[PDB]
Amino acid sequence: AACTNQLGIVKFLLQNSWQTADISARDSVGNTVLHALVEVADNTADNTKFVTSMYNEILMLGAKLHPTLKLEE
Amino acid sequence: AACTNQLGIVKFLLQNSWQTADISARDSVGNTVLHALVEVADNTADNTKFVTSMYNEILMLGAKLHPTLKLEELTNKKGMTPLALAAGTGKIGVLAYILQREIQEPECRHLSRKFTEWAYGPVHSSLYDLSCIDTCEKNSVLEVIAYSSSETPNRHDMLLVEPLNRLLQDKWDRFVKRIFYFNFLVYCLYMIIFTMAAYYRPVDGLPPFKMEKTGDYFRVTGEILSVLGGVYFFFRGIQYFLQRRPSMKTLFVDSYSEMLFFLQSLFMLATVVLYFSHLKEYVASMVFSLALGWTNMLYYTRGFQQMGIYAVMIEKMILRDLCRFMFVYIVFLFGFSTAVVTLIEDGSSYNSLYSTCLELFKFTIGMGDLEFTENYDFKAVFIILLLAYVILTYILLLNMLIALMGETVNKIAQESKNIWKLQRAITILDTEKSFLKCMRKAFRSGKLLQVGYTPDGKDDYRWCFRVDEVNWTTW
Amino acid sequence: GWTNMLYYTRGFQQMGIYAVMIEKMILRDLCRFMFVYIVFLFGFSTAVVTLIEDGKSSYNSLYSTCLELFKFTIGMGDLEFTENYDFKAVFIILLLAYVILTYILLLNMLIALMGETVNKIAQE
Numbered sequence A: 001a002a003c004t005n006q007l008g009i010v011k012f013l014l015q016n017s018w019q020t021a022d023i024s025a026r027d028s029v030g031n032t033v034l035h036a037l038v039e040v041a042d043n044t045a046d047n048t049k050f051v052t053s054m055y056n057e058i059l060m061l062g063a064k065l066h067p068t069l070k071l072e073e
Numbered sequence B: 001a002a003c004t005n006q007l008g009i010v011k012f013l014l015q016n017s018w019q020t021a022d023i024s025a026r027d028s029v030g031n032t033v034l035h036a037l038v039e040v041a042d043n044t045a046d047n048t049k050f051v052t053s054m055y056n057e058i059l060m061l062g063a064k065l066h067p068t069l070k071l072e073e074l075t076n077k078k079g080m081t082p083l084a085l086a087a088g089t090g091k092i093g094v095l096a097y098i099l100q101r102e103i104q105e106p107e108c109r110h111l112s113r114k115f116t117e118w119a120y121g122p123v124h125s126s127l128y129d130l131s132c133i134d135t136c137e138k139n140s141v142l143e144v145i146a147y148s149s150s151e152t153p154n155r156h157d158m159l160l161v162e163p164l165n166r167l168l169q170d171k172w173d174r175f176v177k178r179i180f181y182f183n184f185l186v187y188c189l190y191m192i193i194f195t196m197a198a199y200y201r202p203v204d205g206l207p208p209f210k211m212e213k214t215g216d217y218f219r220v221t222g223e224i225l226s227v228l229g230g231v232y233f234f235f236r237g238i239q240y241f242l243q244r245r246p247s248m249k250t251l252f253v254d255s256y257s258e259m260l261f262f263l264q265s266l267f268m269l270a271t272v273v274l275y276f277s278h279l280k281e282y283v284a285s286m287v288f289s290l291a292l293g294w295t296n297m298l299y300y301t302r303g304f305q306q307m308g309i310y311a312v313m314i315e316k317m318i319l320r321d322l323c324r325f326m327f328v329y330i331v332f333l334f335g336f337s338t339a340v341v342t343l344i345e346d347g348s349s350y351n352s353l354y355s356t357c358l359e360l361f362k363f364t365i366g367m368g369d370l371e372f373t374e375n376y377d378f379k380a381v382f383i384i385l386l387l388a389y390v391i392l393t394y395i396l397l398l399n400m401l402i403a404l405m406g407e408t409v410n411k412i413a414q415e416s417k418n419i420w421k422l423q424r425a426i427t428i429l430d431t432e433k434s435f436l437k438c439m440r441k442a443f444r445s446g447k448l449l450q451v452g453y454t455p456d457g458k459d460d461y462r463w464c465f466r467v468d469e470v471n472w473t474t475w
Numbered sequence C: 001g002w003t004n005m006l007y008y009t010r011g012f013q014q015m016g017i018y019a020v021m022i023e024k025m026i027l028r029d030l031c032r033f034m035f036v037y038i039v040f041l042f043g044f045s046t047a048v049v050t051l052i053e054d055g056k057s058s059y060n061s062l063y064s065t066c067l068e069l070f071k072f073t074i075g076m077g078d079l080e081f082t083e084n085y086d087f088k089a090v091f092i093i094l095l096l097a098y099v100i101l102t103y104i105l106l107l108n109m110l111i112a113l114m115g116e117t118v119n120k121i122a123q124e
Ligand SMILES: CCCC[N@@+]1(CCCCCN2CCCC[C@H]2C(=O)Nc2c(C)cccc2C)CCCC[C@H]1C(=O)Nc1c(C)cccc1C
Pocket: B253, B254, B255, B256, B257, B258, B260, B295, B296, B298, B299, B314, B315, B318, B419, B422, B423, B426, C097, C101
């Protein structure tokens, strides 16, 4: 959801009622959501625009949900 | 009605109530309406605009009225399809439209030529139809663009349209690069054998020479191999002159490599003729065939991108800056040489036009002597003439030549790259068309994929070339 | 050793950019020019040595004649260095062709290409 520019869907998947996704869950290579978000960027205009935008969005969401978690480290 | 940008009248003439105009009707030349739409285009912006739009509309209408009619494939009396005609005549906007024609309407979607295949997330695979583009057919777009004469405009810019550049690069990287390198190596070996057979030539007596020592066996082997190489290049040049049937202007403006290799072969044959006629002069001919030989290796620089662009620039300078510079320079040099010889009394006797031209040319080299000067009668006149010659040619013309080359370089950055691409394209087509059936069909391009369903209902198989793309909008 | 002091030009902005441009030329332009120039020089040197009969500085060797034709590039060449052939016209034609191709065409074209490269690598 992050790497395909659905802000609504990621907001839902983080703040639903049935089951909320883990923000700091890592994949096979060990990437969080932020690592994959970085690795999808390719230094163009709109791509950089939305990657930076949703990077910021996920930072605010993580600060709200887990204020004691330093997601970026 | 179509060529005048009148959509309504076209729709009426096709979908009226009293008499419908035929859509496959042909004129005296045999051109259909699509051929005419192609010949109307002149590569300008608005013209290409409505020609593409009207081609689209009339093709869709032809599909709707006649789903069983392949309008795009109809040929005129030249057997020359609308795509083929657009390629040959040099209409680039129409070609760019046709080769990337993508139609959204599912009822006639089979018309299009660029098919998206899967669009997971932001990535798209695309198939470009290669029918009547690859060399396997006759009058293919690639062959027609490559073997086009000099007059056809946009000749080396028609080859940047998708998928043509990618298709040619795929042919190259897949099987043509290896063959080109092997040819390069064989030519290098031929030139080395020729060079070392020339270097150790016998110097005593008249030709031919009695093969006596052990090394003489090696030398006659090298001589034979050089003669075979020369005759092979001679016959290859003759085959070129027969295959392409080029005009005199085309020969003298756009076949320089073929002309040069042919000329070197001519020099080799003259060398053989003289050598078997007991003449020292054979060496002269042989020597020229040597120099050209090594020079001709710059041909193979087209296999490499940087060096290919470099050699293209070399040619552009030779053909446009150096020629005019040499004309002016010859005028000045001959004028002042005649003047100086007129001053000079009984002449290293410099009372001949050749010797004085040689001195005044030494001035251009950077080895000019101002003091071969004991044999005139007026020192002031002589030195004024020499200073005038120096200032005009050495200081003015040469630096002006440097400046003009700088300007030309700044002016042909892109044309050089396009010309190199076209040179490599000619190399690829010639290499491919010069093999056997087994290998040629063993290295066709693209797959025989399933596009979709023809309006008849059955499957549609098209030789499609696959291209991967990413887009960060239009989800 | 001495030509490694250009390394320390890093510490000064103008000289550092200058040395970076020197590197860029050596890699972009000089290599291509040298390849083409070597091809031409070797071809014409082989032709001239073949034409030249018994050398007896006895330029009937490939090395000495390559050196003689290289002298032209540095503005010090001699158009009549041997007199030891059988066809003066062929010798002169070859030397004039070499001078026109390399001294006039190639070297000035190299200057032009360095000019363009300077224009294009101002910020890099
Ligand atoms: C100036 C011709 C270059 C044009 N050419 C030929 C390149 C192969 C050998 C060229 N050699 C190599 C060295 C540099 C110059 C030249 C040469 O030997 N000079 C020369 C002479 C005449 C006498 C004595 C001594 C010398 C050095 C480039 C590639 C394809 C064949 C042809 C061409 O036709 N190119 C093209 C096409 C296909 C289509 C459209 C337009 C164009 C321009």
